[PDB]
Design an enzyme around this catalytic site. Structure first.
Site, PDB file in Angstrom:
ATOM      1  N   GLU A  70       0.678  -1.052  -0.074  1.00  0.00           N
ATOM      2  CA  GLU A  70       0.028  -0.084  -0.088  1.00  0.00           C
ATOM      3  C   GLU A  70       0.978   1.281   0.039  1.00  0.00           C
ATOM      4  OE1 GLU A  70      -2.949  -0.265  -0.757  1.00  0.00           O
ATOM      5  OE2 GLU A  70      -3.237  -2.515  -0.459  1.00  0.00           O
TER       6      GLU A  70
ATOM      7  N   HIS B 182      -1.132  -1.778  -9.159  1.00  0.00           N
ATOM      8  CA  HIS B 182      -0.862  -3.297  -9.509  1.00  0.00           C
ATOM      9  C   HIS B 182      -0.407  -3.437 -10.899  1.00  0.00           C
ATOM     10  CE1 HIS B 182      -4.659  -3.384  -6.777  1.00  0.00           C
ATOM     11  NE2 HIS B 182      -3.578  -3.426  -6.049  1.00  0.00           N
TER      12      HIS B 182
ATOM     13  N   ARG C 161      24.163   0.479   1.759  1.00  0.00           N
ATOM     14  CA  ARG C 161      25.021  -0.715   1.926  1.00  0.00           C
ATOM     15  C   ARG C 161      26.392  -0.690   0.939  1.00  0.00           C
ATOM     16  NH1 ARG C 161      19.696  -2.469   2.770  1.00  0.00           N
ATOM     17  NH2 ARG C 161      19.332  -2.935   0.542  1.00  0.00           N
TER      18      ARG C 161
ATOM     19  N   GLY D 213      29.235  -0.423   2.055  1.00  0.00           N
ATOM     20  CA  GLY D 213      30.493  -1.140   2.772  1.00  0.00           C
ATOM     21  C   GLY D 213      30.145  -2.852   2.356  1.00  0.00           C
TER      22      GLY D 213
ATOM     23  N   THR E  23      26.141  -5.622  -8.148  1.00  0.00           N
ATOM     24  CA  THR E  23      27.269  -6.772  -8.156  1.00  0.00           C
ATOM     25  C   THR E  23      27.643  -7.369  -6.739  1.00  0.00           C
ATOM     26  OG1 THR E  23      28.632  -5.396  -9.831  1.00  0.00           O
ATOM     27  CG2 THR E  23      29.728  -7.199  -8.848  1.00  0.00           C
TER      28      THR E  23
ATOM     29  N   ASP F 236      24.527 -28.123  -3.808  1.00  0.00           N
ATOM     30  CA  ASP F 236      24.250 -26.726  -4.387  1.00  0.00           C
ATOM     31  C   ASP F 236      24.844 -26.454  -5.695  1.00  0.00           C
ATOM     32  OD1 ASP F 236      23.084 -26.280  -1.567  1.00  0.00           O
ATOM     33  OD2 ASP F 236      25.412 -25.933  -0.959  1.00  0.00           O
TER      34      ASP F 236
ATOM     35  N   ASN G  98      29.845 -14.522 -11.348  1.00  0.00           N
ATOM     36  CA  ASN G  98      29.488 -13.541 -12.341  1.00  0.00           C
ATOM     37  C   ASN G  98      31.064 -12.997 -12.895  1.00  0.00           C
ATOM     38  OD1 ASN G  98      30.574 -11.701 -10.453  1.00  0.00           O
ATOM     39  ND2 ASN G  98      28.520 -11.380  -9.796  1.00  0.00           N
TER      40      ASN G  98
ATOM     41  N   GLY H  18      32.528 -33.179   0.665  1.00  0.00           N
ATOM     42  CA  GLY H  18      31.524 -33.711  -0.401  1.00  0.00           C
ATOM     43  C   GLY H  18      32.181 -33.749  -1.864  1.00  0.00           C
TER      44      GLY H  18
ATOM     45  N   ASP I 297      37.631 -17.780 -18.320  1.00  0.00           N
ATOM     46  CA  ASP I 297      37.305 -18.107 -16.832  1.00  0.00           C
ATOM     47  C   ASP I 297      38.283 -18.004 -16.300  1.00  0.00           C
ATOM     48  OD1 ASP I 297      34.533 -18.365 -17.951  1.00  0.00           O
ATOM     49  OD2 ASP I 297      34.356 -20.701 -17.353  1.00  0.00           O
TER      50      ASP I 297
HETATM   51 CA   LIG Z   1      37.073 -17.021 -13.072  1.00  0.00          CA
HETATM   52 CA   LIG Z   2      30.840 -29.572  -0.910  1.00  0.00          CA
HETATM   53 CA   LIG Z   3      34.688 -31.465  -1.785  1.00  0.00          CA
HETATM   54 CA   LIG Z   4      27.678  -3.704   0.015  1.00  0.00          CA
HETATM   55 CA   LIG Z   5      33.579 -14.705 -11.530  1.00  0.00          CA
HETATM   56 CA   LIG Z   6      26.712 -27.394  -0.322  1.00  0.00          CA
HETATM   57 CA   LIG Z   7      29.315  -5.570  -4.408  1.00  0.00          CA
HETATM   58 ZN   LIG Z   8      -2.956  -2.795  -4.022  1.00  0.00          ZN
END
Ligand SMILES: [Ca+2]
Ligand SMILES: [Ca+2]
Ligand SMILES: [Ca+2]
Ligand SMILES: [Ca+2]
Ligand SMILES: [Ca+2]
Ligand SMILES: [Ca+2]
Ligand SMILES: [Ca+2]
Ligand SMILES: [Zn+2]
EC number: 3.4.24.40
Length: 469
Positions: A175, A184, A251, A253, A325, A336, A341, A370, A381
């Protein structure tokens, strides 16, 4: 699936814009969504006046119960201490992302933005059906500007107790959004008073992308686990920064989001596995970390601007605003996928079987415990002079995934290991220093005598077992 497969999937999560279709609807870019959410073109600086800062006052008027507001509701009352506390946090979350200053004034004094409770739709008759509403800037009615009035049905438990019922906190933020100039994300005209998500103007009109939406995040494949975002989401940020400019002071820092947070924001912080974050991150400088170490779920963390992550057992619940960034990521004890980037990233998988992808820049990669997989898909890369480091490689356990290259070359014989370079593109060479405990992986991708790819690895590597090619 390879590590590269997982990386590719995460990189192409929630593609949008460029005229594509999703759910039989037009997809809008972040920018297009921001413009459409602000299609009324109303701001506190004037009609069609965009990008300028604003200073606004707010208050909690001491509304009289038998009074009737401009919308015809009655049984009015002042915001409670709890409601005031949460409203101030919602205000702050808008001020974090755009150049808006909010200053409280006394209950009886004229204020730009006001908050009030109602409870009855007519005298002596309680309303259990409605939630809340607000007026956009420059809403002129009987010669008076209603803009900035926000109203909430305090019969709803979430409105009465926003500190413990997160839809109440979202409603405050929503709101206030209206009070600042947001609509909306659709009019839903085709719905004729009974709209559904099928009546949206664009596919990303859901609570995954905007808390100005009423449509479930599940319509775009999100899953917020029964929770509601407290603070402006990705397309809300685009919308409000269009209106009042991006807040370049926020933010600046070195900022940690998630566990061990130094944000001082409830919606950017957690202290337990059960406490689930939902946010779009705005950050204007410094070396920052997404710390999701305390979650047990399998997570997918993407550090690219405008991208979505699957965090804490939710889906598409964390994102990074345009222009931001974020440098570092820490996974949890689950399995995971962590994608960096173009900047130098520190990526840590933690326990579990993780997939790490540094991308461009000089990255520092920690698999943790793991069976982890470190993925590479371009010479850049890990260019000589800015090499990635894998800091905890265990032979026979971890793997290096170079499988992109032979797939792209459509040849099992492009990448192959040799004991010396000849200049032939595709040659890969391992060099082990037993004294320093460092292995060099050099690859000649581009076809020169000097390799154009060099990864530095702490630990032994066994060529027979440790690659995916
Ligand atoms: Ca890299
Ligand atoms: Ca791991
Ligand atoms: Ca590992
Ligand atoms: Ca920051
Ligand atoms: Ca990178
Ligand atoms: Ca993990
Ligand atoms: Ca940053
Ligand atoms: Zn609304």
């Amino acid at each position: 699936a390879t590590g590269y497969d997982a990386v590719d999937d995460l990189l192409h999560y929630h593609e949008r814009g460029n005229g594509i279709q999703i759910n039989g609807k037009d997809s809008f870019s972040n920018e297009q969504a921001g413009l459409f959410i602000t299609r009324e073109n109303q701001t506190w600086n004037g009609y069609k006046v965009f990008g300028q800062p604003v200073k606004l006052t707010f208050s909690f008027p001491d509304y009289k119960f038998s009074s009737t507001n401009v919308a015809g509701d009655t049984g009015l009352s002042k915001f409670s201490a709890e409601q005031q506390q949460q409203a101030k946090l919602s205000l702050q979350s808008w001020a974090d992302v755009a150049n808006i200053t909010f200053t409280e004034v006394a209950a009886g004094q004229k204020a730009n933005i006001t908050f009030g409770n109602y409870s009855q739709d007519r005298p002596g008759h309680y309303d259990y059906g409605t939630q809340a509403y607000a007026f956009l800037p420059n809403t002129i009615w009987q010669g008076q500007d209603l803009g900035g009035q926000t109203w909430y049905n305090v019969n709803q438990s979430n409105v009465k107790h926003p500190a413990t019922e997160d839809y109440g906190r979202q409603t405050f933020t929503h709101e206030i959004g209206h009070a600042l100039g947001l609509s909306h994300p659709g009019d839903y005209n085709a719905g004729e008073g009974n709209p559904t998500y099928n009546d949206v103007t664009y596919a990303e009109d859901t609570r995954q992308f905007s808390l100005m939406s009423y449509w479930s995040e599940t319509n775009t494949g999100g899953d917020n686990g029964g929770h509601y975002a407290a603070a402006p989401l990705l397309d809300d940020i685009a919308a409000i920064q269009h209106l009042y400019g991006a807040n370049l002071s926020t933010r600046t820092g070195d900022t940690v989001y998630g566990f061990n947070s130094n944000t001082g924001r409830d919606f950017l912080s957690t202290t337990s596995n059960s406490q689930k974050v939902i946010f779009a991150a705005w950050d204007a400088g410094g070396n920052d970390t997404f710390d999701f170490s305390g979650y047990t779920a399998n997570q997918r963390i993407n550090l690219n601007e405008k991208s979505f992550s699957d965090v804490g057992g939710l889906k598409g619940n964390v994102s990074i605003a345009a222009g931001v960034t974020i440098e570092n990521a820490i996974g949890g004890s689950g399995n995971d996928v962590i994608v960096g980037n173009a900047a130098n990233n520190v990526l840590k998988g933690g326990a579990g079987n993780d997939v790490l992808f540094g991308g461009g820049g000089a990255d520092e990669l920690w698999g943790g415990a793991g069976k982890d997989i470190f993925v590479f898909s371009a010479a850049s890369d890990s260019a000589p002079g800015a090499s990635d480091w894998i800091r905890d490689f265990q032979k026979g356990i971890d793997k290096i995934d170079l499988s992109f290259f032979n797939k792209e070359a459509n040849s099992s014989d492009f990448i192959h290991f040799v004991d010396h370079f000849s200049g032939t593109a595709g040659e890969a060479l391992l060099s082990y220093n037993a004294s320093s405990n460092v292995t060099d992986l050099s690859v000649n991708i581009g076809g020169h005598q000097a390799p154009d790819f060099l990864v530095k690895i702490v630990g032994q590597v066994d060529v027979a077992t440790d690659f995916i090619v």
